[PDB]
Amino acid sequence: GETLGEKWKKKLNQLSRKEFDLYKKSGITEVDRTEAKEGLKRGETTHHAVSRGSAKLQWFVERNMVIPEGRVIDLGCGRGGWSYYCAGLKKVTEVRGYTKGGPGHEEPVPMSTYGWNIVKLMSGKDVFYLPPEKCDTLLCDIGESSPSPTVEESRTIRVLKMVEPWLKNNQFCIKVLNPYMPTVIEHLERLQRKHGGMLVRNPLSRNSTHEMYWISNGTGNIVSSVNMVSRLLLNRFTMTHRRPTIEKDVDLGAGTRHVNAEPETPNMDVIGERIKRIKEEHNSTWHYDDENPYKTWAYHGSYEVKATGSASSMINGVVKLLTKPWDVVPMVTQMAMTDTTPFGQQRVFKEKVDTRTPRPLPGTRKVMEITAEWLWRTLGRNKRPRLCTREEFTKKVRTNWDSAKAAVEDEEFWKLVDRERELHKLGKCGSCVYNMSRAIWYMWLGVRYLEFEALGFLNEDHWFSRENSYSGVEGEGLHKLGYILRDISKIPGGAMYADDTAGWDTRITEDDLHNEEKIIQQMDPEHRQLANAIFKLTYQNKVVKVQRPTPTGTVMDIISRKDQRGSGQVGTYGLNTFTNMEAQLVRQMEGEGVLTKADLENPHLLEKKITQWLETKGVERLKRMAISGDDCVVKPIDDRFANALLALNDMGKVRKDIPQWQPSKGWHDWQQVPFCSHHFHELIMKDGRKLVVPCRPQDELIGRARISQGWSLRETACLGKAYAQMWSLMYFHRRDLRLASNAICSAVPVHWVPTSRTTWSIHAHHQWMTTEDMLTVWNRVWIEENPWMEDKTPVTTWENVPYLGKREDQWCGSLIGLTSRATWAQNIPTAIQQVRSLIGNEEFLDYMP
Numbered sequence: 001g002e003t004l005g006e007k008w009k010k011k012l013n014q015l016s017r018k019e020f021d022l023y024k025k026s027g028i029t030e031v032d033r034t035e036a037k038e039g040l041k042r043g044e045t046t047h048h049a050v051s052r053g054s055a056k057l058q059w060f061v062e063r064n065m066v067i068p069e070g071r072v073i074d075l076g077c078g079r080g081g082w083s084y085y086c087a088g089l090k091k092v093t094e095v096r097g098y099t100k101g102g103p104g105h106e107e108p109v110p111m112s113t114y115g116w117n118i119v120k121l122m123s124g125k126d127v128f129y130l131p132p133e134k135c136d137t138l139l140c141d142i143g144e145s146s147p148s149p150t151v152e153e154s155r156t157i158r159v160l161k162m163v164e165p166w167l168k169n170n171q172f173c174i175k176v177l178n179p180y181m182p183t184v185i186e187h188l189e190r191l192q193r194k195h196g197g198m199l200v201r202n203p204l205s206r207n208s209t210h211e212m213y214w215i216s217n218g219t220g221n222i223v224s225s226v227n228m229v230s231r232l233l234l235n236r237f238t239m240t241h242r243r244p245t246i247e248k249d250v251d252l253g254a255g256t257r258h259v260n261a262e263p264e265t266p267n268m269d270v271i272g273e274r275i276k277r278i279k280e281e282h283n284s285t286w287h288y289d290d291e292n293p294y295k296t297w298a299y300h301g302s303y304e305v306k307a308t309g310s311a312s313s314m315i316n317g318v319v320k321l322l323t324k325p326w327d328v329v330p331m332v333t334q335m336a337m338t339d340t341t342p343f344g345q346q347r348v349f350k351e352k353v354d355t356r357t358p359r360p361l362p363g364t365r366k367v368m369e370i371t372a373e374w375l376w377r378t379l380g381r382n383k384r385p386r387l388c389t390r391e392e393f394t395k396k397v398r399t400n401w402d403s404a405k406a407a408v409e410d411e412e413f414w415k416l417v418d419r420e421r422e423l424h425k426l427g428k429c430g431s432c433v434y435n436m437s438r439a440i441w442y443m444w445l446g447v448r449y450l451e452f453e454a455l456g457f458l459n460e461d462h463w464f465s466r467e468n469s470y471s472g473v474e475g476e477g478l479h480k481l482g483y484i485l486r487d488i489s490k491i492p493g494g495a496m497y498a499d500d501t502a503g504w505d506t507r508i509t510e511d512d513l514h515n516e517e518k519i520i521q522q523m524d525p526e527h528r529q530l531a532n533a534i535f536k537l538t539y540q541n542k543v544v545k546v547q548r549p550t551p552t553g554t555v556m557d558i559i560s561r562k563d564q565r566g567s568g569q570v571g572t573y574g575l576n577t578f579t580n581m582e583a584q585l586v587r588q589m590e591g592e593g594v595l596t597k598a599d600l601e602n603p604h605l606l607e608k609k610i611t612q613w614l615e616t617k618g619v620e621r622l623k624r625m626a627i628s629g630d631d632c633v634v635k636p637i638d639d640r641f642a643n644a645l646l647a648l649n650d651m652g653k654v655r656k657d658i659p660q661w662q663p664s665k666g667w668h669d670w671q672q673v674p675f676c677s678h679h680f681h682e683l684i685m686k687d688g689r690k691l692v693v694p695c696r697p698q699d700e701l702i703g704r705a706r707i708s709q710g711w712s713l714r715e716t717a718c719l720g721k722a723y724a725q726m727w728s729l730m731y732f733h734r735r736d737l738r739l740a741s742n743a744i745c746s747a748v749p750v751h752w753v754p755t756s757r758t759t760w761s762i763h764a765h766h767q768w769m770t771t772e773d774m775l776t777v778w779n780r781v782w783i784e785e786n787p788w789m790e791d792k793t794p795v796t797t798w799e800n801v802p803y804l805g806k807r808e809d810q811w812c813g814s815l816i817g818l819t820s821r822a823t824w825a826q827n828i829p830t831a832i833q834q835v836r837s838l839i840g841n842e843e844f845l846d847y848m849p
């Protein structure tokens with residue numbers, strides 16, 4: 001009567017240390033603990049999970065196997081991974097963690113992750129000595145392995161007998177250390193009749209343990225579930241070793257949680273029609289899921305869908321063949337780590353989007369209102385807002401997709417746009433929904449068109465060009481940003497600050513939205529009517545579609561939110577640049593002592609002082625900044641700005657990767673300032689002329705070019721050629737990239753015109769999307785059209801196009817000097833031939849220097 005589990009145990013115990021270390025992780029799932037372990041070593045108390053346990057519990061919670069609610073009790077909490085995870089879930093009101101502690105036992109790790117204020121972890125509490133307490137969720141992860149399965153059987157039954165009296169029509173998730181021993185099976189079968197639930201295997205569990213979890217939400221055959229795991233674990237001994245599937249670890253946020261402040265109160269008069277139409281369109285599967293996870297977004301209903309997305313990105317085989325040394329580079333592989341499945345979407349939504357920003361103080365709201373009014377008057381001094389048109393939108397769609405091109409050519413699409421526009425003119429919206437059938441697609445593209453019609457002027461007419469806005473960089477181009485930062489560096493004063501905001505779009509408040517909409521005051525009446533509908537009905541009352549996995553299949557949830565920026569809405573870039581200019585001017589006023597703590601708290605703050613500063617210094621202060629959406633560089637009049645955090649945090653623009661009240665750190669060397677994911681180097685050309693060039697860690701450049709878009713080798717090769725040409729024009733100064741670009745261009749047929757874009761950045765002008773000789777394009781961009789290049793003498797050779805210094809190239813990720821890189825360089829004509837052979841007997845040219 002020997003079980004398959006007992007057979008697995010005998011085989012496991014016979015493994016040598018070498019084969020046991022390989023087997024334990026073969027084909028498992030594992031979170032990358034690198035960042036958290038280093039953060040915990042540095043004493044950081046925000047974002048990080050204290051152990052692998054938070055991700056372990058997330059696996060069950062995201063599958064609805066256990067849905068913590070009310071008073072949660074965590075038995076054997078150890079460091080607290082399960083408890084800290086629970087603190088941020090919708091229905092959880094209190095988390096009580098109990099753990100033994102003492103020598104050889106894990107102790108609770110104090111943290112300040114989101115909801116720490118409802119987490120009560122107690123050491124010195126051996127749960128086997130504790131009387132059961134009333135709770136709504138019972139969690140238990142206790143069970144120490146033993147080479148003897150009978151010692152494990154005794155430990156398992158001891159846990160099962162300890163936990164059972166805590167169970168009373170509540171949620172639960174209990175580790176069953178050894179579920180294969182017949183006496184454990186018998187006991188679980190009796191427990192399942194009294195308390196329900198089922199046994200599940202968590203794929204984050206190592207193969208060296210047969211642990212399973214008894215979870216409350218589900219049913220099934222315990223014997224079948226146990227034996228299926230035994231078979232899997234047995235097959236894994238002989239299976240060719242598979243490296244573990246790596247997943248991103250959890251981000252548990254920061255700060256106190258006020259459960260009563262989380263719920264969203266929707267404006268049903270405004271959003272009711274949109275919900276009604278989605279319901280009618282998907283009426284056959286429309287349902288109202290009470291188990292939805294949304295804390296701060298209003299939930300309206302769901303319909304059934306097939307799952308969209310992938311765990312990882314597709315790989316460009318042509319670029320991979322010509323970049324062999326980078327196959328072992330972690331940052332290069334980490335680039336291709338993007339989970340867009342309903343699982344990945346829900347994790348991002350919980351961690352980043354499902355938050356609420358406190359309302360700023362009345363004095364802060366007063367300063368923002370004064371500043372916004374002044375800024376809009378400044379921005380509209382020369383230009384007038386204007387309506388964009390069908391003809392203009394059609395032109396943008398055509399010149400940038402295949403379905404969008406078909407749609408804009410369809411008279412039915414524009415008939416639908418007209419019908420919706422007529423509702424907007426009446427102060428009603430019926431079909432404008434965004435995402436986190438052609439009718440669904442026509443309604444979506446139609447929504448984007450109406451937004452473009454009303455607010456497209458901000459981008460189409462370059463309202464944020466440096467000439468129009470002083471701080472802006474819209475239309476400038478990556479090749480000009482470095483020269484702009486060098487120009488800012490000449491302004492006397494403090495260091496150059498470049499603080500990033502954590503999730504800027506989620507930090508856009510109702511006050512920000514009301515300040516942004518003031519641009520309608522400058523519009524013609526018919527335009528004001530259309531923009532007012534966009535701001536009020538759609539930007540300040542967003543209806544969103546988001547996928548969610550469930551035990552029975554995937555669903556599309558319909559949710560809503562009044563504040564935050566609609567990241568998937570047109571106008572985002574311009575409105576973010578506007579609000580960020582305003583926010584940074586307010587921070588400069590605080591740095592200068594114009595705006596004080598007393599002023600921010602004042603409910604009847606006087607405007608005189610603020611207007612005087614804006615009218616006398618405002619433009620000078622805008623010229624000290626480079627602002628692109630949520631990204632900024634600010635060079636204030638002195639360094640008091642580093643310590644000026646009251647208004648910035650009060651406006652909701654909390655800085656990323658730094659404690660709330662820690663002063664910022666700036667740079668005096670403009671070449672080290674980060675901006676738009678780049679930094680910029682000043683180089684001296686062989687002919688003595690200076691050039692300012694853009695740069696980023698080389699692994700990001702290679703990692704990105706190794707990611708395919710959109711069977712078919714031609715499209716893969718052409719996208720490879722597009723990255724190669726972008727490298728020759730923008731990143732020619734990186735040794736590895738100029739060599740790899742020459743290799744790719746030698747490997748791809750000369751007449752094949754680059755297809756598909758390398759980037760969607762607003763800073764990209766795509767001068768590399770051509771068959772024209774790259775040196776004549778280089779001369780055009782860098783010499784002829786370059787306003788910071790006085791001597792217009794062309795360069796006749798790539799030998800006169802400069803590289804970074806060797807040490808600088810290496811600091812920025814070059815592999816120059818490594819043996820693998822020398823081997824790669826030697827192997828280039830061979831790698832080129834390999835790609836050429838895979839493509840076939842086409843016409844190729846040799847670009848190798």
Ligand SMILES: COc1cc(OC)c(-c2ccc(C#CCO)s2)cc1C(=O)NS(=O)(=O)[C@@H]1CCC[C@@H](OC)C1
Nearest residue numbers: 477478479676677704730758759760761763764765766
């Ligand atoms: C913020 O990221 C970028 C910023 C850029 O410039 C500021 C660029 C550019 C590359 C080449 C450029 C040029 C030029 C001259 O016209 S501009 C490229 C990227 C870039 O990574 N583009 S991307 O691969 O499509 C990336 C994926 C994830 C973040 C996204 O944010 C825009 C875009």
Ligand SMILES: Nc1ncnc2c1ncn2[C@@H]1O[C@H](CSCC[C@H](N)C(=O)O)[C@@H](O)[C@H]1O
Nearest residue numbers: 051053076078081082099100105106126127
């Ligand atoms: N008798 C007992 N009473 C309380 N805690 C106990 C115990 N026996 C073992 N433990 C604790 O139970 C824990 C199980 S592992 C805890 C991991 C946790 N779920 C997390 O996510 O961080 C260990 O830390 C161990 O010290």
Ligand SMILES: [Mg+2]
Nearest residue numbers: 498500631632
């Ligand atoms: Mg920045």
Ligand SMILES: [Zn+2]
Nearest residue numbers: 429430431432
């Ligand atoms: Zn609408």
Ligand SMILES: [Zn+2]
Nearest residue numbers: 679695696812
């Ligand atoms: Zn660099």
